[PDB]
Design a protein around this ligand. Structure first.
Ligand code: EJ6
Ligand code: TTP
Ligand code: MG
Length: 665
């Protein structure tokens, strides 16, 4: 299990060259056998730099560090992350890592080697696209894009479609605000007919996601505000039951929900469905300005239908019960608590619901992501190295900022947006793993403090780097007029006062003289592929299991949690019988009578951990997060009241993203 990883790392080493620069030459020199077309697999510019510096570069690589990958982490590396020559891997992990670092840092060889070390030791990681394409010809290094529908017209709709198509091709995830498109049955002046509405146009988007699928199908998340008249239909179209023309199951679904709707639901008032043609401008305002405008149309009776707000609500909950979706975002908090509110109202988040960025017809938002491994900063004295964490966080910020400049953009609107506001999104993995390492259960008061200190540190480290860059490079163009320019920082907009761990007075004074380089910095994302690679538990998120199991070609694996295992082995209580005992407990200790009630607390599973405390923790770290978090909700046995109970708590806590996916048993 641990051994098979050693073998597979060694075989690979046996079947690839050892010299980094010589591997780079082979990739660059690659020739299409069918064709004779010289089809370089790294950019020439990267290779020149490598060859000009081959002694430092080749020498700096430490191939011991290939052996840090666990088995399935490695297999995944070999399947998608290591460049192949005619179906044979050419690249060692270390080789790809060096490629990524030279690819980001170019001629600054010091900066490159620091990054290689940091990466190769697994202090952090860049997201998959940037691992895939750094050091490569016309390299698309960004994970996600967000789009506001261009125009409420066929010219507009198919223009956006082409953008989504081009972004899909280049490996971008998409989030799209569709709320301006006019409702089913609304009048069309120039042809004197009526709109077929949202469903039939989303059907075209759905086929486009299927068609442009380079190996998972294209991923588009569609954003609807609940005042729009097609809402009930929009909740139907994910479901596995019903008419084909009424469905779009390859798409993803999210609600961009105003405060006003939530208040109507709890007070049990009436909700007014509208058409954006009839009642324009609702998505371009938020909070009180929205509510005044929403009320205005309502007093005029420009209202296509009215319903019990509690009727919509039930429609949403059954969707989540059946489908796991839609995602729950609160437009008012997102807008209220944004360093970008400077630029206008923000109409959607992205595919994974952690990114909150402005878009318009001239602007497709982007975000480059990397993630810090939180387990990494636990000392052997069970101390947490906040100083180090901020050390590494500052590197990441600079890297991500370098990415903005060298990225190749699939559409010009995205280039403009990204160099205008220079947002980035740093996230995390192994938040659970850190806790176990510090001997804190997830729900303990110590974990709840740690949680805040970690995210205070990262946000502190981040701003501090961004600040230095504004020193060297200057502020981003739209810095002036922003909350941060006005001395307001993210915790201030949540009305929180930081722990005394870091001196914000200093920083708020550094930022006042120089400004910052990046409009936004922090956004915990899902990390599904990158956490499996590095063997850390997903982003935030309690441990799912003490046991991970997998049927492979040569039978099965049953990998007990490494953190648990070292501890039972130590407190000499480990047995092979306990392995099969756990499986019956579906991942859980708690039942096994032979195990310490101290350990049992520490390795409690996700299905056995308070979702309220989860929400409370998101909210507490949320105050140190510029953007949002891809927060799943685990409720084994859902019902109407539970989900309702959960959503309102999330909302009242002031979460920008109340729920990402709903997971059940
Ligand atoms: C306020 C709140 C927030 C989020 C949330 F998910 C929920 C419930 C739907 C949610 N229901 S539940 O998951 O089935 C559940 C229901 C009841 C209990 Cl006692 C627990 C529980 O979760 C796991 C262990 N605990 C403490 C819950 N989390 N924490 C809690 O006290 O209840 C509530 C009541
Ligand atoms: C022409 C057409 C438009 N539509 C939808 C797309 C948009 O939501 C909306 C407007 O389409 P447009 O292309 O704007 O139609 P138009 O310019 O002729 O009308 P207007 O002067 O009212 O702008 O109607 C259909 O659903 N089916 C159709 O066949
Ligand atoms: Mg028109």
């Amino acid at each position: 299990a641990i051994l098979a990883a050693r073998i597979a790392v060694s075989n690979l080493h046996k079947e690839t060259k050892k010299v980094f620069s010589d591997v780079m030459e082979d990739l660059y020199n690659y020739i299409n056998p069918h064709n004779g077309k010289h089809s370089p697999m790294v950019a020439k510019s990267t290779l020149d730099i490598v060859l000009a510096n081959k002694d430092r570069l080749n020498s700096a690589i430490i191939y011991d560090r290939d052996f840090s990958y666990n088995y399935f982490g490695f297999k995944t590396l070999e399947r998608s992350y290591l460049l192949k020559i005619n179906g044979k891997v050419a690249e060692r992990p270390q080789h790809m890592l060096m490629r990524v670092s030279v690819g980001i840092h170019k001629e600054d060889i010091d900066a490159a080697i620091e990054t290689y070390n940091l990466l190769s030791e697994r202090w952090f990681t860049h997201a998959s696209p940037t691992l895939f394409n750094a050091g490569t010809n016309r390299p698309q290094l960004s994970s996600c894009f967000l789009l506001s529908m261009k125009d409420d017209s066929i010219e507009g709709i198919y223009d956006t479609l082409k953008q989504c198509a081009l972004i899909s091709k280049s490996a971008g995830g998409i989030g799209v605000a569709v709320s301006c498109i006019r409702a089913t049955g609304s009048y069309i002046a120039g042809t004197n007919g009526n709109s077929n509405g949202l469903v039939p146009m989303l059907r075209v988007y759905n086929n486009t996601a299927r068609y442009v699928d380079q190996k998972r199908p294209g991923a588009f998340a569609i954003y609807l505000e609940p005042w729009h008249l097609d809402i009930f239909e929009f909740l139907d179209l994910k479901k596995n039951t019903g008419k084909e023309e009424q469905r779009a199951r390859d798409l993803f679904f999210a609600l961009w929900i105003p405060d006003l709707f939530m208040k109507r639901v709890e007070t049990n008032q009436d909700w007014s469905l509208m058409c954006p043609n009839e009642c324009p401008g609702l998505d371009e305002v938020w909070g009180e300005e929205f509510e005044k405008l929403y009320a205005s149309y309502e007093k005029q009776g420009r209202v296509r239908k009215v319903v019990k707000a509690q009727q919509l609500w039930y429609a949403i909950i059954e969707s989540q019960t059946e489908t796991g979706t839609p995602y729950m975002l609160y437009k008012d908090s997102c807008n209220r608590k944004s360093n970008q509110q400077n630029l206008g109202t923000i109409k959607c988040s992205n595919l994974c619901t952690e990114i909150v960025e402005y878009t318009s017809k001239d602007e497709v938002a982007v975000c480059n992501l990397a993630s810090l491994a939180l387990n990494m900063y636990v000392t052997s004295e069970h101390t947490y190295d906040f100083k180090k964490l901020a050390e590494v966080t500052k590197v990441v910020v600079r890297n991500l900022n370098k990415i903005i400049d060298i990225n190749y953009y699939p559409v010009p609107e995205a280039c403009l947006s990204n160099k205008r506001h220079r947002p980035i999104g740093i996230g995390v993995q192994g938040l659970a793993d850190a806790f176990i390492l510090m001997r804190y259960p997830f729900e303990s008061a110590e974990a709840q403090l740690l949680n805040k200190q970690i995210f205070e540190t990262i946000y502190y480290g981040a701003l501090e780097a961004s600040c230095d860059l504004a020193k060297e490079q200057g502020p981003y163009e739209t810095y002036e007029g922003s909350p941060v320019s006005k001395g307001i920082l993210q915790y201030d907009m949540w009305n929180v006062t930081p722990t005394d761990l870091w001196d914000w007075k200093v920083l708020k004074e550094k930022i006042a003289k120089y400004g910052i380089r990046n409009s936004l910095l922090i956004a915990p994302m899902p990390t599904a592929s990158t956490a499996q690679i590095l063997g850390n538990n997903e982003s935030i998120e309690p441990y799912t299991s003490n046991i991970y199991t997998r049927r492979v070609l040569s039978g099965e694996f049953q990998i007990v949690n490494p953190h648990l295992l070292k501890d039972l082995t130590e407190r000499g209580l480990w047995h092979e019988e306990m392995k099969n005992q756990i499986i019956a407990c579906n991942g859980s200790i708690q039942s096994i009578p032979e195990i310490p009630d101290d350990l049992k607390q520490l390795y409690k599973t996700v299905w056995e951990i308070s979702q309220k405390t989860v929400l409370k923790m998101a909210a507490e770290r949320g105050a140190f997060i510029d953007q949002s978090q891809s927060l799943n909700i685990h409720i084994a046995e859902p019902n109407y009241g539970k989900l309702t109970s959960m959503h309102f708590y999330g909302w009242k806590q002031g979460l920008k993203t109340g729920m990402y996916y709903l997971r059940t048993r």
